[PDB]
Design a protein around this ligand. Sequence first.
Ligand SMILES: O=C(O)[C@H]1O[C@H](O[C@@H]2[C@H](O)[C@@H](O)[C@@H](O[C@@H]3[C@H](O)[C@@H](O)[C@@H](O)O[C@@H]3C(=O)O)O[C@@H]2C(=O)O)[C@H](O)[C@@H](O)[C@H]1O
Ligand SMILES: [Ca+2]
Length: 399
Amino acid sequence: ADLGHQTLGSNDGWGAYSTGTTGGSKASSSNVYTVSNRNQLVSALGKETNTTPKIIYIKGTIDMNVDDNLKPLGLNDYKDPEYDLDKYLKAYDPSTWGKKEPSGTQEEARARSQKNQKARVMVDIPANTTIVGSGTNAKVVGGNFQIKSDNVIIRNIEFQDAYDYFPQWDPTDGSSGNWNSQYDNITINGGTHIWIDHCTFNDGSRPDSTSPKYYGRKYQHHDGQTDASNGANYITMSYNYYHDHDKSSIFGSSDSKTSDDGKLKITLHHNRYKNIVQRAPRVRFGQVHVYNNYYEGSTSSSSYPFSYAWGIGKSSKIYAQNNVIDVPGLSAAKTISVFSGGTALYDSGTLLNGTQINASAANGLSSSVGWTPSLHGSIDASANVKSNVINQAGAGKLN
Ligand SMILES: O=C(O)[C@H]1O[C@H](O[C@@H]2[C@H](O)[C@@H](O)[C@@H](O[C@@H]3[C@H](O)[C@@H](O)[C@@H](O)O[C@@H]3C(=O)O)O[C@@H]2C(=O)O)[C@H](O)[C@@H](O)[C@H]1O
Ligand SMILES: [Ca+2]
């Protein structure tokens, strides 16, 4: 079958569970679309409830920050008339506002501004849809695909720079507050039976290094790359290339979301993470199979220095096999970050700078996560992972 008609193999990770992931492979000829701009993409997707099987080819670059005439939209185009960053900073400075959630005029005007941009950049992917890049240079720029539906395939696309002009100040986030932006490249929000394969995710021409600090905190314009929340389940992400980005992949958005227990069943394999800071992935609750991924970076780079690969969140159940981490000078323990409620990690065959290590043991965690993956393809020997992943992962690799 051609790329648009290809489906997830029956053993290929959690996405292959039950009815599996066939996306729009059954599309009639009338439901095969080629799109080269935001209007065409919106047209092809239709309503969030459009379950008609469909195939959508992305041709060239689709900039999502554009108007109905495909004209670029910048900050001033979205900015609410009443919003002003300097006034917002004065309004909510912890020295005069304290640590309560911002509210009142400036925060209302920021929220309106954010919603104006969201209306352009975020699109819902309806059920039974396959979206694939044409050739080797298909790009989605500024966009955030949201998947709340079942049975969706996304392949062979480079997603760049899902950038929020109006990050929200959250003074209770973390120990000193944080700025939080709204857009990921792909947000799986309750979505099920999803395959993300041979895509590239990066921050385009707007790396985080150029962002100022306000209240001593990075004014963060990006969020995640491929995130999963709200009972998302049965997902495979394979052969993707994540690069030059801070928070890559968060699975399970909250310690309070206990309904995520038994869900967030995700398989990550043969992905490449290069100059990714953290969350690769950060997991709460889920049974997440992580195998044959390649992580590379430097703790001392001026842009996107490595912090950790796996985030052991509340009740997480990561089962890791044959993954390879090249971060010169890193200790075995620092390959992961352990959060409260994070007590267990299975890892086998982990290599760090060529040395066999045991990340779980190095952090004194339980060696068992209470399950063993059964749905998976062939697991490469660790010694072959770097080469296989560098050569095969990312958009533009299928010709
Ligand atoms: O639970 C989380 O995932 C956590 O993530 C962000 O925080 C991270 C990190 O988890 C924090 O411990 C903190 O890390 C600091 C440096 O960034 C890190 O390199 C190291 O030096 O430790 C520092 C520290 O202990 O303070 O901040 C990180 C960051 O700012 O990205 C969220 O900010 C946080 O709210 C929470 O979600
Ligand atoms: Ca997100």
